[PDB]
């Protein structure tokens, strides 16, 4: 009866050629955990915490220089009310996987200075699982908040498996079981990241080209969750990303797997078109939820240039 949609395109420059970006909202502001690992005679590996200011990315800290890691780690960032918890884990090759996992933890309560200490998850739960980096937040389960590190099986029991920490990332002793009955043999999962919205657990992952899949989980008992596929398939459109605005899903799509244009659907009703022809596509377009009625759609059309679409959506019946 009353629907409002407002979109704003903007451009942010970046002096660092990040291999991968990792956006996060802290105190209503945009940040990025930038991995800089460009191969060269004088190029070193860095992991920068950056902050979007005006039309630029401001480099604040380099977390890698405070660690002992030689190469690219798995980054798991957990954001609370005013806290930031970043873990840089050693990417151990499947064949040469040792029984314990060494991570370098970082804690901050201002978004400026970080305490750092190396941690070791002894006899860790995800030895037989593949990990992928993501930004996340607390999940409340038995009147208790947990950070989650989830892995996936490569290709009979527990394809998805999570490690949890109720002490702000100090110890990863807790084991959260995930029951996905539509698991398949002969297929592989990739880039599995949990999507947490209003204390509901969901997962965004690739299946394989690779196709995005989205599952919705419900808490069964103890630390077990039962998940089922959430169909977002659209004919002549390729599923890209899922987020929630106004207690409803907002879903992004590509025209084909080349991503000349991107479509954003609101509650599977209204849609907006993202055409990357103002300056070259929308590959890797990712949602960044700011609040219940505000969110961002970010992609990098060219090297160092960030197209940030700011989306406002509401129903005022």
């Amino acid at each position, epitope marked *: 009866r009353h629907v409002f949609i407002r979109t704003e395109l903007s451009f942010i420059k970046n002096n660092v050629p990040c291999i991968r970006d990792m956006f996060f909202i802290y105190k209503r502001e945009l940040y990025n955990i930038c991995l800089d690992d460009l191969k060269g005679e004088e190029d070193e590996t860095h992991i920068y915490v950056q902050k979007k200011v005006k039309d630029s990315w401001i480099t604040l800290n380099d977390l890698f*220089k405070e660690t*002992d*890691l*030689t*190469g690219r780690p798995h980054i798991f960032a957990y954001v609370d009310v005013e806290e930031i918890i970043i873990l840089l884990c*050693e*990417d*151990e*090759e499947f064949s*040469n996987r*040792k029984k314990d996992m*060494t991570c370098h933890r970082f804690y901050s309560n201002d978004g400026k200075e970080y305490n750092n200490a*190396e941690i070791t998850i002894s006899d860790y739960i995800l030895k037989d699982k593949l990990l992928s980096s993501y930004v996340s937040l607390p999940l409340k389960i038995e009147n208790r908040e947990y950070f989650l590190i989830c892995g996936v099986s490569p290709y009979k029991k527990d394809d998805i498996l999570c490690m949890a920490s109720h002490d702000k990332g100090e110890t990863w002793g807790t084991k959260i079981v995930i029951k996905y009955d539509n698991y398949k043999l002969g297929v592989q999962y990739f880039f599995l990241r949990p999507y947490i919205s209003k204390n509901d657990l969901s997962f965004h992952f690739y299946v394989g080209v690779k196709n995005v899949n989205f599952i919705e989980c419900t808490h069964e008992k103890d630390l077990e969750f039962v998940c089922s596929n959430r169909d977002f398939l659209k004919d002549n459109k390729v599923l890209q990303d899922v987020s929630t605005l106004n207690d409803e899903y907002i879903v992004s799509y590509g025209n084909d797997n080349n991503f000349a244009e991107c479509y954003i659907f609101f509650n599977n009703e209204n849609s907006i078109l993202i055409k990357p022809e103002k300056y070259a596509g929308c590959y890797g377009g990712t949602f960044v939820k700011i609040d219940e009625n505000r969110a961002l759609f970010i992609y990098s059309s060219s090297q160092g240039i960030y197209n940030i679409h700011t989306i406002y959506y509401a129903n005022y019946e």
Partner: antibody
Amino acid sequence: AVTLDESGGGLQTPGGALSLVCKASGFDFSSYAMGWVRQAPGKGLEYVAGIRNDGSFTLYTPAVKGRATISRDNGQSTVRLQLNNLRAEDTATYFCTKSADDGGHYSDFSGEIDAWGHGTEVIVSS
Amino acid sequence: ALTQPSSVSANPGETVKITCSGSTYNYGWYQQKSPGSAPVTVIYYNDKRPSDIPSRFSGSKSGSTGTLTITGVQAEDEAVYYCGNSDSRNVAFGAGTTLTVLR
């Protein structure tokens, strides 16, 4: 019985190049980080070059940075050190070393060595 | 830099402590009885002892310091020990600490 047999050293021409080779055995070569450590006459141990278990990461001492290449053949259980444009400062005993880890952390290279080669003298002289 | 004493002296039977500082990461301890003669890892990975090394040898790490401890030091332990570790993303060794056991 871990064994680290070093070769390719001795008298070298100043300005020329060397090719140290360490043939390993008695362990799973592909799992560990390997490296070279040298000891100059009357000086202590200096770490020369290091290489990850899968050869995807290398490191070099500033004294050799620009004129060195550490490579490995996990199939032949070999680690090679090439040292171009040799100086009298590179005259030392060189030792092949096996780390107790993959080389995913800098302390694996010089803080986790669990096997040392007998050493090979290299004299850079005219 | 990685810092360890230049020398440490002990009478046979005593407990010996050599400290190395400058790194918050994993310490290694290498015994060399003669220059050019190959080192022998006494302790690696802070407190791991190779099976063929005597049980008197122990390792420890507190803060940004690693400590080699020889309990009931023997005359044969007289040798120069080098600590090994990373020093701010640089692979490194200390200058050596020459121990003398007064037989």
